[PDB]
């Protein structure tokens, strides 16, 4: 099976490295047919990017005919393109999608997932929320339960900050978005809670419906009625108390119980492992 | 598909109820063919147990010919029986197993899982560790990652007793409350003396680290009134233990209080912690139900 790798920054390079470490027997048949950046299309799996052709992700898609697209490109919160149009075309063609790019999902979740479900196409999106720490995929192992509310710390960069020296270290460590105002001004946290509300609660929201601010903890919240992101004081008994540094946490409340998962919120290798986890699950037919 | 339900105490009853809530489309073809207690065999799905036949779990297996056994019976750490021999017969007959009963897996994990792998039979065992809080099933969504070490509070009953004693309640009243809530093992010495926690860390070491250990390999102690102290379980590639330890304020496990449990899993990629209710009949039954749905999805 052939992957098209869309993006080759820190996450894309880390993903290619993880694939080549041969971490699961069911990835033995998986090859990268092509890699696309802003600089063009490489129709080969190489450690170093050198373009073979000029052209965008649609040209690469037509040239390669991939079985799966792995989207690790920059978030475009303006309109989610070209990923939004690309996912739609891939789903129509029966091409599975694995993504760490929040933007098309933060803007158009219902449109994308409705189309996928109607076509029997699978979407892996673990890396969009808390990188490699099961979040999306945690919910996959909570079947037959109704999610009532969601609460968490969903942005790694800003939690690591909690100024100029802090950010600089975070950018050095690769935690930050290419546009780091997306981290600071809360877009990233709001995108993640949007994705979580859609998937787990079923509350069809876009990032436009979320009330949010920026950088006590930056708390993202969703229930059946509302979705928001705001700073709040935290109790000592509250399980979010000492989720500090790059750490992120997701508290899922159901009809049965409340559970919390905590882990590294950001980090290119962690994000890439999220996408890799989705790939293994796809291969097992468990997405 | 037909289930044989082995046991009908708090967990079994809660499981039956959850199945009847029809919580997933995967479960539409799933029926209980029989329920076994130490009072005999009920060849019917009913809220209250009344035996139709006298006989043990083996006789029930023969009479029902189930597609799946759900083991919610009492732990037997002396020898894991009759569950251990039952699992071996089931696997050989192509019968899948879902269990919340730790004993056979704490004694003979490699034997059971080797036999199962060879026959292509699936084993759900989420409920053996932290009830309905993904633990076993959390590791299922961490594929292609090597587990280096694990540390946690793995017994709800003793955590609940430690917390209440910190709140100035006697050990004796804290235990009675744990029992009233249905947190405790039928034999509460299994919780108190650390057997239950040791069983769980054994299972995790086997499943996640891949070392073929048994409960006899674990150095463990439990709790008493004489001792924040937390009953800490730990495993890595070289050692497995359970002991009550003083816990500092900055430790992620400091505020894991009451019946809450928590597991920190360190992989080659990352360190993660999951926390939630350690015990509770409905929580345990939900663990088993989660395994059932995953089994139907072919994702065990
Ligand atoms: N950083 C983290 O820790 C983390 C954790 C979870 C999720 N994520 C998500 O993962 C994604 C990638 O993160 P990253 O840190 O790897 O960013 P990055 O290092 O800037 O990589 C972005 C890659 O996408 C390519 N790209 C961007 N826009 C494109 C376009 N219009 N056409 C073709 N290629 C394009 C870039 O090409 P050039 O090489 O030519 O610039 C670059 O190779 C982001 O969406 C982010 O939100 C990141
Ligand atoms: N307590 C929790 O919240 C929790 C959480 C996770 C896992 N678990 C595990 O789940 C299991 C069941 O828990 P529970 O609270 O439901 O215990 P329980 O209330 O004591 O129920 C045990 C059931 O098994 C039956 N049984 C025991 N030995 C048997 C034998 N040799 N043959 C036939 N039937 C037998 C009992 O029959 P009678 O009714 O006739 O006595 C009873 O119906 C235990 O292994 C426990 O470790 C419990």
Author numbering:
A (entry chain B): 1 to 162, 171 to 223, 233 to 304
B (entry chain A): 1 to 227, 232 to 304
The paper states:
Homoserine dehydrogenase (HSD) catalyzes NAD(P)H-dependent production of homoserine from L-aspartate-4-semialdehyde and functions in the aspartate pathway, catalyzing the synthesis of cysteine, threonine and methionine from aspartate in plants, fungi, yeast, bacteria and archaea. When overexpressed as an immature enzyme in the mesophilic bacterium Escherichia coli, recombinant homoserine dehydrogenase from the hyperthermophilic archaeon Sulfurisphaera tokodaii (StHSD) was markedly activated by heat treatment.
This structure was designated the IM/NADP/BU structure. The immature enzyme, but not the mature enzyme, formed a complex that included NADP+, despite its absence during crystallization. This indicates that the opening to the substrate-binding pocket in the immature enzyme is not sufficient for substrate-binding, efficient catalytic turnover or release of NADP+. Arg38 forms two hydrogen bonds with Glu186 to enclose the bound NAD(P)+ within the ligand-bound structures (the IM/NADP/BU and M/NAD/Cys structures). The side chains of Arg38 and Arg39 form hydrogen bonds with the phosphate group at the 2′- position of the ribose moiety of NADP+, but not NAD+, within the ligand-bound structures. This tight binding of NADP+ can restrain turnover, resulting in the inactivation of the NADP+-bound immature enzyme.
